[PDB]
Design an enzyme around this catalytic site. Structure first.
Site, short mmCIF file in Angstrom:
data_model
loop_
_atom_site.label_atom_id
_atom_site.label_comp_id
_atom_site.label_asym_id
_atom_site.label_seq_id
_atom_site.Cartn_x
_atom_site.Cartn_y
_atom_site.Cartn_z
N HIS A 23 0.84 -1.19 0.00
CA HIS A 23 0.00 0.00 0.00
C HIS A 23 0.88 1.25 0.00
O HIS A 23 2.08 1.17 0.25
CB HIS A 23 -0.99 -0.03 1.17
CG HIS A 23 -0.50 0.70 2.40
ND1 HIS A 23 -1.03 1.92 2.80
CD2 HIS A 23 0.46 0.38 3.31
CE1 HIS A 23 -0.40 2.30 3.90
NE2 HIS A 23 0.52 1.35 4.22
N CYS A 53 -5.63 5.40 -0.86
CA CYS A 53 -4.90 4.23 -1.31
C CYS A 53 -5.52 3.74 -2.62
O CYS A 53 -6.69 3.34 -2.64
CB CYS A 53 -4.88 3.13 -0.24
SG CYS A 53 -3.16 2.56 0.04
N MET A 107 -9.24 3.99 1.64
CA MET A 107 -8.99 4.48 2.98
C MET A 107 -9.46 5.93 3.14
O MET A 107 -9.51 6.67 2.17
CB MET A 107 -7.49 4.39 3.29
CG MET A 107 -7.12 3.00 3.80
SD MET A 107 -5.45 3.01 4.43
CE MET A 107 -4.54 2.85 2.90
#
Length: 98
Positions: A39, A83, A91
């Site tokens: 990520h 993200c 997110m």
């Protein structure tokens, strides 16, 4: 006067916390890698300059829980990031300068 946000929760959450963190115009931030990889922290340039956001934009890749990036908020605004990759449901989290 600094601000830090762990990339995920201990338990095992995706969303970043604290979602919102106070920062100063000129200060720096630190995003420690907690989990939920791979990520990254991509920042958009909506209410902020492009080039600027760019820097604020983390086009890296955090895997191990040790490599933490840093950012600097010069302009007193509100930067946002999301993200792109991840492996869940994006997110939620933004920053604010004072």
């Amino acid at each position: 006067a600094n601000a830090t946000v762990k990339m995920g929760s201990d338990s095992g959450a995706l969303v970043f916390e604290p979602s919102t963190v106070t920062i100063k115009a000129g200060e720096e931030v630190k995003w420690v890698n907690n989990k939920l990889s791979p990520h990254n922290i991509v920042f958009a340039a909506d209410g902020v300059d492009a080039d600027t956001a760019a820097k604020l934009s983390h086009k890296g890749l955090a895997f191990a829980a040790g490599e933490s990036f840093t950012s600097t908020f010069t302009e007193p605004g509100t930067y946002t990031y999301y993200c792109e990759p991840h492996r869940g449901a994006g997110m939620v989290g933004k920053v604010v300068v004072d």
